[PDB]
Structures are given as structure tokens and as C-alpha cells.
Amino acid sequence: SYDRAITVFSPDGHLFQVEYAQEAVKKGSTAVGVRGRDIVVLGVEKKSVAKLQDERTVRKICALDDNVCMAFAGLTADARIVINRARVECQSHRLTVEDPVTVEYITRYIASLKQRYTQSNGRRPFGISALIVGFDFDGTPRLYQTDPSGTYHAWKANAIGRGAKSVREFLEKNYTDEAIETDDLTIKLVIKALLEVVQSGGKNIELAVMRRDQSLKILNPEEIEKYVAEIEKEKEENE
Amino acid sequence: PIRALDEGDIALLKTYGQSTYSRQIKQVEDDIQQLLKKINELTGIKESDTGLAPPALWDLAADKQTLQSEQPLQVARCTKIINADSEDPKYIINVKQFAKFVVDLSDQVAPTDIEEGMRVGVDRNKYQIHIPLPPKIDPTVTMMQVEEKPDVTYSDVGGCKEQIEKLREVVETPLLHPERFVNLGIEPPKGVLLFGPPGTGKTLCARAVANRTDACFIRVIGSELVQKYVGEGARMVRELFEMARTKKACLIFFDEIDAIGGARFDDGAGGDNEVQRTMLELINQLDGFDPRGNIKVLMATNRPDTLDPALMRPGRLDRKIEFSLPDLEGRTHIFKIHARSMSVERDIRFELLARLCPNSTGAEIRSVCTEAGMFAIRARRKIATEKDFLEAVNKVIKSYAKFSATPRYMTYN
Amino acid sequence: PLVTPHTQCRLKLLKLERIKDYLLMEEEFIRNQEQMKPLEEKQEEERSKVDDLRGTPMSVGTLEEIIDDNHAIVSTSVGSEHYVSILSFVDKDLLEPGCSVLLNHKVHAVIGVLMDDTDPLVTVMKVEKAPQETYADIGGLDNQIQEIKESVELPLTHPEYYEEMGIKPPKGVILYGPPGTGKTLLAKAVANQTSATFLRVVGSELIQKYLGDGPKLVRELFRVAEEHAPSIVFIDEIDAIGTKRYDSNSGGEREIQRTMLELLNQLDGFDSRGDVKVIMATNRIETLDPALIRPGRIDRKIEFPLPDEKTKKRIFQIHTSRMTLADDVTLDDLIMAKDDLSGADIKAICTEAGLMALRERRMKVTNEDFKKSKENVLYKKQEGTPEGLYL
Amino acid sequence: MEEGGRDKAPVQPQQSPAAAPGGTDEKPSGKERRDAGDKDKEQELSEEDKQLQDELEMLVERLGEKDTSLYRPALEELRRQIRSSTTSMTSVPKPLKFLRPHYGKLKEIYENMAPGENKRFAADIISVLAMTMSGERECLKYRLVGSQEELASWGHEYVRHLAGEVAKEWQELDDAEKVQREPLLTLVKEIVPYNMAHNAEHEACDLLMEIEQVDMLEKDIDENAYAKVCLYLTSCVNYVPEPENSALLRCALGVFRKFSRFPEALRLALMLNDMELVEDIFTSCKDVVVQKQMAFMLGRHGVFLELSEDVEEYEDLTEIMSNVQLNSNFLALARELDIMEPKVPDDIYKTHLENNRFGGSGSQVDSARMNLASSFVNGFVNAAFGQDKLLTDDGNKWLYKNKDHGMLSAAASLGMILLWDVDGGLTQIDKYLYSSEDYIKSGALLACGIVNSGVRNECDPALALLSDYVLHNSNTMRLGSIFGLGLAYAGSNREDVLTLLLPVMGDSKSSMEVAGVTALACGMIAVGSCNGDVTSTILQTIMEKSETELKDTYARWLPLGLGLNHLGKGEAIEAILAALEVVSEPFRSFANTLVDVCAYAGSGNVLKVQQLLHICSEHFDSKEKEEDKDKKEKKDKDKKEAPADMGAHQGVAVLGIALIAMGEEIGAEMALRTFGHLLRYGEPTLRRAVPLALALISVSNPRLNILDTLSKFSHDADPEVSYNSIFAMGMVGSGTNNARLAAMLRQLAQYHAKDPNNLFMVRLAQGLTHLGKGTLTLCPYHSDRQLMSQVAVAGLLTVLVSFLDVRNIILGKSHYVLYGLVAAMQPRMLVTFDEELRPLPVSVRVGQAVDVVGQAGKPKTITGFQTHTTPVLLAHGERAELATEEFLP
Amino acid sequence: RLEGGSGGDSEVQRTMLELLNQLDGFEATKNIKVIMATNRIDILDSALLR
Ligand SMILES: Nc1ncnc2c1ncn2[C@@H]1O[C@H](COP(=O)(O)OP(=O)(O)OP(=O)(O)O)[C@@H](O)[C@H]1O
Ligand SMILES: Nc1ncnc2c1ncn2[C@@H]1O[C@H](COP(=O)(O)OP(=O)(O)OP(=O)(O)O)[C@@H](O)[C@H]1O
Ligand SMILES: [Mg+2]
Ligand SMILES: [Mg+2]
């Protein structure tokens, strides 16, 4: 049971050290994200503040360019490097080619950076998994994800973190064939999906939206408190 | 700020809350469990049988022809004989539970049939040989020399036909054609051990040619050679190898030889408590009395640790036939075996199943076929579908075996 | 088992007094039964003399082989073997090799055959009382409850389904998982609601030291299970009787190993098992002999994990049913903050929170007693986590 | 244990009531105002029921008990205010002041004067102040008053209204499960005058709630499952008006006051039958109230619905009488040829195919009495429209071959072939009728009464079988003609044909078996009135049975129709009637136990069950009255089959132990007919307890006693896997258990479990628990099997067609008016919920799910979903009406 | 609980399992209270610590 090198194949053909990095993702905070008609949205599960520290330095959602977003899991040491690297590449692309950076180009860079970083010994792979959301490529909303093996991949709705399997099974019974228009309805989908949190405290949610033309809009814990109230109010009417 | 409870403070708890039905419901439940007891010693129904006979036929038996069996008849014991002497008996005999004795024969016998290793009738006081008795023939051999047709078809162990072809060449070809051996100038091999993974076809390939022998066949329990009493198992393995060499064209199948095995030519063999009594006597009688025999013996075990190189020195055992896993076509044959005899659909394909069974035994293949039927019982069904088997393979193989983490897959399509 | 108010109500006063009425009458009917029997017997001449023809201190022996000429070969308890006569009133059909007989002292002759009676060691291991409550007692385990009911209760109650497809029922079931999950509960609940003879064997009951007492009991235990019902044999913690088969030449491990081997043999004896079901239960599965775990012997392996945040709601529903719950509590909060406490953890919380109300002199239980019970009970094992490392 | 320093209340209320004798005299203020400061503070330190520990209530009375003994009596000049301050303050701790002889002295502080409105300081507190103490009053103090002196003093007068407001207070404070504490209070107070307590509690419950009725509503009937005679007489009529007056659920009238029909008054439920004809709105609940009124618990209602509204509101009667009977035929016509069944399975006989290779060869059985059982391969399987032209050729040959009693039997099988039929049933008989033989026509025309059984329309009240009866100068024409028409009109209580067939009894033509089944025929008809039947029977009894000491043809048939004429009333006047009427020799006082307990069908009257044991228990009885202890055990079998399994566990506990495992001719001849009478669902406790005594045949006795216990071991309906037991015992029953005697019997048992696929409900339990007799058709056969010689000649009249009250099977049909709906029904293992958290889950076996005509089974309260409201009667009963409504989005 | 005997103890394992099964086996016995006292908390087995 040799699991102590990254360049060795198992006799049934596996790379267990690549496989062990994805177990480190499952100890991370959950984050979901859907794409809408025009407005995309993503939400995170924020852990409890320990009463004696500032909370503007626990940032889990960042923007690479002015029109693309980012949510991750895993461990924050390896996450900070990939964020700081991808801010350079989406900026250096704009210099070499005068367009803004598409959402598909920047995920190939992050995946290829995690790709070549797997192959050599003495390079412990990045134990994070990212979600890249942006309605950037000419009015078209897209969201992708990454993987510690280095495989970028496109979904229409997503969940990561601890117990994402419950959320992914939840969305398939919830994400209707009705494309949820009236974008507060789409936000009400995510807040209801994150209302099936591991704990669902109600005051522990940070959602971030983008109306495809503005900048990033972090919601406030009075507007987000309004949407939690109407979810319980409309659920009481169903009985 | 801890306070404990004073005696008046106990009475606050014990009073409040249904003070009309509290003991009223309780002592009724209390004394009824007392009454469950008091029925049981009052009943005490138990009675004996003691195995008597109806008095139509034993009343005349219960006459003086019981006392004629009391006082004239005797209470003689049985023993074994080590050896003898010439012109004068001086016989050496073990009770072996009491001591070993040097005794005489009594006057009622002739000194001819008091040969070695024989049950004899022994006096309680003078220990003389009263009557020679048979070795209790024959439940010590024929109760496992069953000479009965077993219900295993030749088409049951299909898929491992070349391992069958090895065993069909070793066993069948000297027993029915020792003629090409003369036409070529050779002699057949006379030793094969079987080992490998459990549930592979070991007992099957044994019993299939035990069905196709039309002859004597012996299956041997591995723990039967292990005995409670010291010096008893060797005496048994004496009696097995003697009375099996008598008749012709017989087969003996040893099985689970882990208990009687271990390398005795190598570092161990520091045992010698009734396991080696069986072991040293069998390797004694395996050679010595077998040049150019007629009865083939096969061993089978799950542990390849217990190989004896003295057995594997030629003369005793020659060939290492082990069993393997089916490639695909052996597996697809086996799925057809365990599903032809049950209520299935006429349209399922089995090659899709053996793709999903990379490293598996027919024991597991049988377990899937039973489990897939169990899913049909969960709903109201009477015939199995394709997905019934598909859930079963997921339930058996993709759950406890060597593959996990199915959702994180996304690297291979 | 119909005490269904479960509270201080006059129905249970009426129900139990009905039960008192039928047991007192069944006492008084059998009391009149041994009363009003004027018999005053006189024994038959044949029976009275044979009772004096036999010895008064009769001894128990064992058949080994039979010669039909009214004398055969038997064995004593010590194994001394005797060419004794057999008397011609013994009902000469029950003579099979292995049957127990009665002997004399003078000529040691076979007085009469004994019926197939066993030692007191195995008769303790036969259950007399249905222990505890039914499947409503457990707090939601129904994925696995429906498994064992298919393997045990369904083939006994309704074996029509299996012959409709020609499928034999499974034979052995292993229950495993982390401790405190309910392995012993499901054994007790099946033994409650059954019509089978339920045998209770616990592990190291079965190991003794007289050089043959180990493998003798396995033959006796499954003889009893064969002669009696379609039966359930529950052996608990078989990890104390099975692990990976080492064979040191010292005569301490062999008595384990010979017994270990013959149980696996007597399991697949295949002579006539006659629907004897075997339930086995340990905590760890990894330290087992793989010869036991393989199919052909045992067909079902069942995990009992640390459940979820959903069936916890049912266990807190059950273990708080018989107590005056105050209306300030939100028991979901305790399920919310934690992920890996077990059913035995929940029952300890429910007892401790009740003790805290007695300390501050109450009957109803506030939210604060559950807060203090959670802090007091849980913090003894929780050690080792990388906080700050992840997020 | 750091006490002291904060003990305020163990000091100042230790001193100020100790200074109350120091300040009663010469201190008019401190007598009053320290009493008022004591009273409200002791009141305030009890109202929170999160401090059961009270810093005065077990602190003050250490001296305060000797104080109040010298403060309340010894004052002797008690003012109008100081008694309202003393007794309000000192009647509170007295359950805890005093020990268990408080029960005589809950009054020596309180009932000096009850101060005003004692709930004024006891309103918000549940029971800690005085409500437990109030129950302590009504337990011991009121019962000794109300033992013979109910109409009495203040211990009844104010105690009436005291228990009135207390019983309101249980449904006032929290409205918790203390609702059921009110029947706990109402029934301990004035146990026998429960209705006098309940009359105030009826009207109080009428204005109490209309949502908090239903669990107390089922609380009463759960207490009405079993009680004393007069209590079950009392609270069942208290049960009646609550869905009549408070609510109008009211579709629980017909069956759930058939509960109250026989105990209280037969006309009272006829007044409730009049209360059915009051609330005639509109049709749907009216439809299903009257669905059960024909063939679910009684017939005989076809005389009261031909009044002035004969258009559709009173033209439901004949629709109830025979048309929905024929729509029930359309179940077995349409729906059950759909689910399983072509006209002849005929192959349970063929299921004995594998036997011929079991042990060499076969074709060794040629017994002619097996050909009796050969009638039932055609006989039992052809119930519910198994009509057979030329599949009765096995009958038609053996009818015309030999076996006169089998000629009658195969002719009697044709009525079971066309069962519940009036359309063309007699036309099937007429072609097989005219053979001009005694045995053929007496079997066929008896089977005609089976054909129109349950119809009770105009078929032949005196047309066919009265003309068949007046043919008599001879054999079974004399016998078989009276039986089928009394079998047909068993559900009615008509007087005319009872008086037509009373000169059968009055003929004194001394055919003994004819007069015996005459008592059986009239017994099936009436259960109530016409004491002249009891006169007419005992006339020929004293004429005949006095001048003999012989066979039970006298005993098994003649006193039975008496008890069938007096079934089901625990009044114990019918025992005073009958047993003092037949005061006679003990072989005629065999009849003493019959009409005693035939009036005792089902209740809790355990005092009768001990005289059912203690008088004739064993006595060792050298072959004189051994029939009487069997029949005394026979009556132990009922009064056990409907306390709803409360005594059925006790019954199998007793009769397995001290009977067959501790008994004689009582056990090992007869005591297995309990299990053929207690249940017939089948469960492997008793179904395997019988082959404990059957595989051991115990052949030393006349083994057909134990092979009688073979036969009605398969008296369990609802077909099962029990074939393993029967076919294996038939294999050992071919050679051994000789085929001369029971080769009919084993295959009679074998072919009875699979009678049809369906139609197994013969077990006297409809809706939930009511009888629907029923018993009058079954109980003749288990009385008939005592024991032998009716296996050959006489019992063949009985054993084929004894019990013929099978009512239909299944609660799948919908009947919404066009009968097109199916449902979404959801079958489960039956209810356990008695009082738990609201709302209560009705059942537990959610897995099986059907839509339409699926099966009944033993423990099935099948429910439905999908907002169809199922509003009809909310119990069940297999002709649901099912309206439609969905006003909940 | 260690593994089977090469360096395994495997005999006081049997004795411990009976302590673990004679106080929480098939029968919850009554009026019996045990007091166990030791240091070295992290090394005693986590099945009699439940
Ligand atoms: N190669 C195979 N072909 C067909 N059936 C097989 C094969 N292998 C296993 N089986 C199935 O498994 C069972 C045979 O197992 P087998 O008798 O070989 O076990 P075993 O080798 O005796 O095990 P152990 O060595 O542990 O005692 C049969 O019932 C059969 O259904
Ligand atoms: N799922 C559950 N629902 C209700 N009670 C539970 C549950 N799980 C555990 N308990 C409680 O825990 C107690 C012990 O459970 P049990 O001993 O059966 O678990 P176990 O797996 O057998 O543990 P061990 O193997 O250590 O004996 C039971 O008495 C029961 O009250
Ligand atoms: Mg094998
Ligand atoms: Mg346990």
C-alpha cells in the first residue's frame, strides 16, 4: 500500500497522493453557486467569529478581475497563492491582448498551474477546489469549478465543502426546468439551499451576487435577514 | 450554591404528581412479576423418559435371563496391541488411558488371531485377553467413504477448464487408461496439492470428479484428524490408510489441512501434541506402503504456509495445481450458471456484469445473484430486471471491496 | 405487551388488573389440579421389579458402537470402554452412536437409554424472557432494520417469496460499526418480537480448559439449535474467538484455534441445519479471520455509522418522552452544534440534564440543564483538530 | 451542604405562625394581617411549578401541624373572615402534612368551611395545590359516602359542583392529555352513578370544545372495551349522544351504537335507528350508515324504510337489501375474475403431484371415503361465482355411483358454488333436481337455502322448502328441508315461518336428528324474543331426554338453539330463566353451561370465568360427566375472542399450560377447539403449538380426537404458507393415520385454507370490534364435533355448510356515485396509538401501497391521502363513499 | 484491543470483553455500581469509556 510518492502508479492504476488531496477539500467550508438569467450568485457558510478578532481578514470570496469572482475550499495557505497568482494572469492577459479576460481563459490557467505542480516530487499539490463565476464573456453568464487533480469543468449549479453531497442531491430536486427569473427568486433559491446548511444558524450566511454589469455586491445582514424572513413566511403558507 | 437534599426535601419530590395512582399502578405491576415467579415453581412440569420399552416383549426378557446376563456375563475392557513374541505370548498392550501392560491371553482363544493393532477383550483383574474383536468395521472409513453420487454437474464449474484439464489428466488417465503409459514408456504422477483463494472452486473441482468417478471416493474433514485424546488420532489415520488401500480405484480428498500441516522439514516442528501423532503417522504410511499404488489422495487448503517439502520431495507429492480467477468468459459463464435456475428476464446481458467484476470469485458471483433477487422481493416483483443486478453489484463490489470515492471521479471520462 | 397509555391513567390500572385476574386464576386452576386427584397408585409388578433390577445409583455413559447380540461397546466419562451387555428392555431402536445411556456399577451394563439431554452450561444460554421494547424503542435505523427483517423474520413468517424465484435465504449476518450505536438493541428487539428460539452466547462463554471442552460445546450448542426451532443463534463479540489464525506450538493458543476452526466447520456443517440463523456482532471488522467473512458462510455485512442530524431528532424524541419537558428547550440546537455523538451519548445527556434539575431543586428541565449536561458529559474524548489550518 | 444564613422562610414563617396563638387573642390585627401575609406568600411560593420545593410548605408544619390542631378547632369562635384565611392557608399542605391516613381527614381543615372559590388561588397551578387533593377526596371520601348514601350531605351537595368546576379545570388550564383525567375523575366519583356524574359532564363537554372531543371520544370506547356489567351498561349509553349533540360526526351511529344495542335496550338503538331517520342530510353519510345495516352486523331492517318518502331517500332500502348485495356480487363477478381467478383452479388436488415419486411409486390409495373429500376440489374453490357446467361431472358421476350421504353432500356443494345469488341460482338446481331420490333432492333443496342466503327477498319464504318439508313421511326430506330456509332467514327475526316450523318441534315424529337440527334451525333465526320457542323446545326435551341417558344428538343440538335464542346479554336473568327451567338430572344439567354463557359472548366478566373453572375443574371423574367439563371449556373459548387480544394472550397462556400440558379428557380430547375458535388469522405461536400435539398424534386414544384437532387446526382462513405443515402431514397421513377415517379430513383441512383466493372474513369483527353474528352459524360446528360417528353419517349435514356468514372481504371500492373512482389507499400494520403526541401517527408499515381492490389482512387500518378528505365515517368498512375537496393551498 | 497474537496479548482481551459484556450485555442488571480508578486516561480502550 504505497502512498508515499506522487510519481508512482498503483497496480490497479491510481495516484493516491492526488486522491488524498481531495480529502482535504472535504474539511473546508461549503460554498454553492448558481447562474441565473442575467444575475449570477454564490453563497458561503461563514464560520462563527470568536468574539475577539476583526473579521475583514477572513475573506473567502474574492474577485480576480472586475467581472469575475471566486470561491474556494480547502486550506487558506494554498488558496492565497492561487488567488494572488491568478490576479496577475488576468491582468497580464489584458496587456498582451487588449480584451478583457474571459471566464474560460482564467480557469484554464488555474487548472494548468495546478497541473504542472502535481507532476514533480517535492511539490505538495494544492489542496483547494475553486468556483469561478462570471457573466463576463459578452453578456453570457458562466460558472466553472476546479479540482486538485487540475481538471476545470463546467456546471450549472455547484456545491463544495463538508457535506456537499447533501446539497448537490438537494439542488437536483430543487433546480427547476423553469429557469428562475426575477433575480430575487434566484437569490431565494440559494438562500433556501444554504438554509439546508450543516447548521443553518441563519445569521451565518454571506451571499455575493453580480448583476452582469455592476461590480461585486456583498449583501448586508439586514437585506439578507429580509430574505430569510420571507422564506419562512412562504413556507408556512404551503401548509 | 450546590445544595443537597434534606429529608423533608425528599418528600416534596415523592409526593407531587398523581398521588392517587402512583403506588396504585405500581404494586399491581410489582406483585404480578412476583406472581410470574410463583407460577413457575408451582408448575415445575419437567419429567423424564429413561428410554424403556413396551412390556409386551420385555416381560419374559425381564425374567432370569437378565441375571443370566448379570452374573455369568462379564465386564471386559478393550485395548490395542503393540506387538507379540515368539513361542510364548508376552503380549504388550495399552489401555493408554490407564497404563500399558505386559499381559497374557486367556485359555478360551487360539494365539493365531491376536495380531498387532487389534481390539481385544481384557480382564478387569488379571488383564488377560478374553476375546479378539474386530477394529469396529466399518464406520471409521465408510461413514466418509460414502460411495454415493453427489449432485454436482460437470457444467457447474465451467470457466476454469484448464485447471480441470490438469486435474482430468492427473486423476482420470491412470485410473482408466494405464496403457499409453506402457505404449510410451512412462508412469503417471501421484501427487497434487491444491491451494489458492477461498471460494475458488476447490471443493467444486473435487466434487465434480467425485461425481465423475463411478468408484470409491473419500472426503476427509480437517478437524476430524484432530482428536481430544492423546494417541487417538494416529490410531484413526492408521485405520484410514489401511482399509482404503484394500479395494481398488478409490480417491481420498484431504481438505483444510492447515490443522494437520506446517513445515516439519523446516524451522518449526516444535509441536508434538497429538497433531504430530496424526502427522508423523500419515507421512509414515504415505510412502513405505505406496510404491505403485491405485488410490490417489488430494490435499486442499487456503494457506500456502503449511507446505511440507518432505511431502514435496517426490514420491509423496509432485504438482502445485492452484486455481485462478476467470478472465471474462469464465465469469460470464458463471453468471449464466447461477441465473439459469431462477426467475429472470429473457433479455439481460451478462458480459456487462463481468466488466463490473474485475477481481471476484464465484462465491461473490453467487452472492450477487442472490442479492439481486433480494431487491426483487423489496418491491412486488417475480422476475428480475437489468437494474436489479446493477444495484447488487454496487451493493456488493462497489461498497466493501477495494474501490471507494466514486463521486470524485472527474479525471477519466 | 399492550400497556399503551404509558402514563398514569386508569386504563393501565384497568389493564394490569385484568392481567392479575388471569394469572391468579391460572394459579388456582393448577392448584385445584394437584388437589383433586385421588389416585393412590400401585405400581405394576414388571415396572417395580425392574426398578430394583437396575442399580439405584445409575451412572450416565456414552454409546460408541453397537453389536446387535445384546452386548455392545460404550464409553465412560473418563473414556474407559467396556464390552457390556445391553438389557432387553431398552427399546432397541434409539441406539445410535452418540446417544447417551444409563449404566450399572457391577457389570456396567446398559440399563436404559437416556433422552438427548445436555449439560447445564448450554441451558443457561437459552433465553426465557423477552427482554425489552419493540422496534418503536429505537430512534430511526430503518435502512438497516428492513435489512435484518428480510433475512430473519420474513423467511420464517412468509417463505412464499423465495420459492417464487428459487432463491435460498441468507445464512449469517454480521453487525459492525463504532460502539454505542445499537448493535445490542437490534439483537434484543428481534428477540422480543419473534417466534424463534433465541440463543444468547457471548464470546468468551465458549472457551474452557479441559482440552476438549472448547469444540465440544459448539457441537452441543448447534445440536440444541437443530433439534429445536427454526432458531436464532446470537453470538456476541466473535473477535474474542476469531483473528487471523496463528499457530504457535504452545498449548494455549491451540485450544482457541481448534475451537475457532470447528465453529467455522460446524457453521457449514450442511448435514441438516434446518433453518438455524446466526447473528454475529463486533465493533471492529478489520481484525477478523477472512475465512469467516467470506460468502458461503456469512452473506450480510451491515454498517451502523454515527447516524446523521435527522435520526438524532427521533432519539431525542424517544429518550425525553417519559419526563416533564419544559417549553423553553430547543433540542434541535444540540443536534445543530454537534455532528458525531451516538445513541448512548444521547441517553447520557437525557439522564444528566434530569440530574441537574434535581440539583437546583426542580421537576421540569430548562434549556440550561441541557447546556450543562452537554458540557459535562462530552468533554472527555475530544482531542486533536487543526483549527485555523483549514477554513 | 452550606445551609444557614439565607434561611429566611424557615425562621419568620417559623415564628409568626408560632406567634399566631401568641397573637390571636389580645391582637386582633396580628391575628388577621399576619394571616393574610402568610396566606398570599404561601400561595405565591407554590404557583410556579418549577419550584416543587416550597420554603414553607414542608417547613412550617413541623410545628404548624400541632399549631393548626390548636388553632383551627381550639379557637371555637371562628369569624367570617378568619375561616377564609385559615382554611385557605392550611388546607393546602394537608396532603403533605399528613401521611396515608389522610384519606379520612381531608376534611378536618377543609370541610370546616370551604372558603369561597378555592380555585381562586388554585387556577393557574396544575395539580400541586389542590387538584391532586381533589382527586384524593373523590377516591376514598366520596365512595364511602356514595356506597349506599349518594343522596347525602355537603360531601355530595357542594362536591357535585366542586367536581363540576374541577372537571372543567382539566380542559381549562393547558388542555393537555389531562382531558383524559376527566373520565378518570368522573368514573371514580360515583362509580355506579357515573351517568349522574356524566350528565353534567355531557352538557359541559357539549359546550367545551369541538376539536378536543375526539381523543376523549375514543378514550371512552377504550374504557368501554371492558368494564363491569353495570359500568359497560352505563358509559356506553353515555358514549352515544356526544357525536349526536356536541358534534355531528354522526356516521359512527349505526355500528358504534350496535355496541349499545344489546346491553342497554334493543329499542334504544331502534330509537337510534329512529335517530338515523332523523338526520337524513343529505345522502352520503346516510348511505354508509345504512350500508352496514343489512349484511355487516344485522339484517331485519327492511320494514322501517317504506314510509312516505319512497322516491330515492326511502328507496335506498331495497338497494341496501339486495342491490348493493348484487353490487357486491359484481365485485366477485367483475373485479375478482380480473385479479386472479378463472372458473376452475381445481389443482390443490393436483398440488399432490410430487408425492407419487416420494418413495418409489404411487397409486396405492383407493379408499372410497376419500371420494367425500373429492367433492371439495369442486366444492370450496367455486365459492363466489365458480359456476361449473360439466366441471361438476366428478360430482355427477359420484352422485350417481354410491354414497347416499355423499349424494346429499355433493348436492349441498352446489349451493356453495352459487353463493350470494338470487338471479339464476334455482335454475342451476332444477336441472340437477329431478332424479326423484331422497338424498339428492334433500341435499339440493337444502342448498337452495344457501343460494338465497343473505338475500331475504321473495325467493321462497314458504314456496319451495315448505313444500319440500310437507313431503315428509320418511328420511332427510323430513330433515334437510327445515335447515336451509332457517339458514336463509337467519338474519331475519320474522315470526311467521318460525310459527310455520314450530310444528316440526310439535310433531313429535321421533326422528331424533330432525328435532335436533330443528333447534339449530330456529336458533339461527332469533336471538331475542319469542320465549315460546324456549317453551316448545323443552317440552320435547322433557318428553325424550328424560327417558334416556344416551347420546349427544340430544345434547349437542337441542340446548344450543336455546342459547342461540338468548345470545349476547350479560344480564344474568337468562341463566335464572333457563337453569331453573331445566332443573333435572345431571346428564340433562349438561345444558346448564350452555345458555349460561351463550348470553356471555364477549366482555370482561372474569367472575364468570372463575365459576367457569372452579366448579367443574378436574375431579378425576371416571367417565360420567366428562362431556360437561368439555362444554364448560367450550364456553371458555368465547368471552375470550373479543376483549381484543387482552385476554387472548391470557387464553393461550392458560389453555396451553393447564390443559394439554397439565390435563385429561378435557385437554387431550377437546381443548384444541379454542384455537379453532379464538382467532382464525393464523400466527406461528399457536399455529406451531398445535403440531406439538399433532405430529405427536398420541395414538393410544381414539386418535380421531386428536385428528379432530388436526381438522380445525386448518380452521384458519386467509390463505398462507401453512401448506408445508399440511402436505407433509398428509404424506405421513396416507399410510399411517389411516386413510379409512381421515383421508377426507386432512384434505378437508388442506382444501379449506385456500377456500377462495378471497372472502375469508368470518371472524365477528367489523369496523374495529363489533360482533355481527355470525356466531350463530360458526358455533354450531364446534359444538357438532363432539366427537366421532358424525365423520360418517350425521355430521355431513353440518361439516360442509355449517358456517356460511362470509362477508365480503376487502375495503377496495369507491362508489362515488357512478362507481368510477379507484383510490390512492395506503395499507399498513394496525393502529397502536392510544394517547401520545397530537396528531398521532395512525400506523407504521408505510411500504405497501395500492390504489383499488387490494386485500384486507389481519392488522390493516388502510388509510388514504391526496386530499380526497375520505370524510365518510373515518373508521372504515369496505363501502366508503369518498367525496372530493381541496381547499388547502 | 490489539491484533491477533504474534506480539498480541489476546487473552486478557477475552477477560476485558466479558467485563464489557457482563455490565452492558443482553440484560441491564440493577443495584450494582462500579467504581473504577486509574490515571493514564488516553490509553484505556474507548469501548468501556462510552
Ligand atoms: N470457479 C467457479 N465456478 C463456478 N462456481 C464457483 C466457482 N468458484 C466459486 N463458485 C461458487 O462458490 C462455491 C464454491 O466454493 P468452494 O467450495 O471452492 O470454496 P472452498 O474453496 O471450499 O473455500 P475454503 O477453501 O475457504 O473452504 C460454489 O457454491 C459455487 O457456487
Ligand atoms: N439509534 C438508537 N436509538 C435509540 N437508542 C439508542 C440508539 N443507539 C444507542 N442507543 C442507546 O444506547 C444504548 C447502548 O446501545 P448498544 O449497546 O446496543 O450499542 P452497541 O453498538 O451494542 O454498543 P456496544 O457494541 O459497545 O455494546 C442502548 O441502551 C440504547 O438505549
Ligand atoms: Mg470448502
Ligand atoms: Mg453491546
Short mmCIF file of C-alpha atoms and ligand atoms in Angstrom, two decimals, chain C residues 180 183-185 236-237 283, chain E residues 20-21 24-26 50, ligand 4:
data_model
loop_
_atom_site.label_atom_id
_atom_site.label_comp_id
_atom_site.label_asym_id
_atom_site.label_seq_id
_atom_site.Cartn_x
_atom_site.Cartn_y
_atom_site.Cartn_z
CA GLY C 180 -22.66 2.69 21.30
CA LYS C 183 -25.92 -3.41 17.84
CA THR C 184 -27.17 -4.95 21.08
CA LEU C 185 -30.53 -3.12 20.75
CA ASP C 236 -21.66 -11.54 20.52
CA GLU C 237 -18.08 -10.25 20.07
CA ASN C 283 -17.07 -3.36 16.88
CA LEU E 20 -17.62 -5.19 28.75
CA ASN E 21 -20.46 -7.68 28.32
CA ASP E 24 -23.89 -3.87 29.31
CA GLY E 25 -24.79 -7.09 27.57
CA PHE E 26 -28.23 -8.51 26.95
CA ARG E 50 -18.55 5.11 26.16
MG MG F 4 -23.31 -4.46 23.29
#
